[PDB]
């Protein structure tokens, strides 16, 4: 019943692929909510103009 979110930001200079390095992810937030999640989506900010 706990939703855990961990996050990390890292500057990158490589063009496309993931970098060859190591970096841990410190905890960001914990939420005490009980939902039996099975699937998820994503949100896009398209330029409506």
Partner 1 sequence: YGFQPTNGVGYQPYRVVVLSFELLHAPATVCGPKKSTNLVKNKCVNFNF
Ligand X SMILES: *[C@@H]1O[C@H](CO)[C@@H](O)[C@H](O)[C@H]1NC(C)=O
Decide which of partner 1, ligand X, none touches 2; Cβ closer than 5 to 8 Å per partner kind. Answer: partner 1
Q: Is 2 in the site for partner 1 (CB under 8 A)?
A: yes
Q: Minimum distance from CB of 40 to partner 1 (Å)?
A: 22
* 32 forms part of the interface with partner 1 (CB under 8 A): yes
Which residues are CB-contacts of 32 (< 8 A; sequence separation ≥ 6)?
Answer: 1, 2
Q: What is the dihedral of CA 20, 5, 35, 38, to 10 degrees?
A: -10
Binding residues for partner 1, per CB under 8 A?
Answer: 1-2, 32, 34
């Amino acid at each position: 019943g706990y939703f855990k979110i961990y996050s990390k930001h890292t500057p990158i200079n490589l063009v496309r692929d993931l970098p060859q390095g190591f970096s841990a992810l410190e905890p960001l937030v914990d939420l005490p909510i009980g939902i039996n999640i099975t699937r998820f989506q994503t949100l896009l900010a398209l330029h409506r103009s």
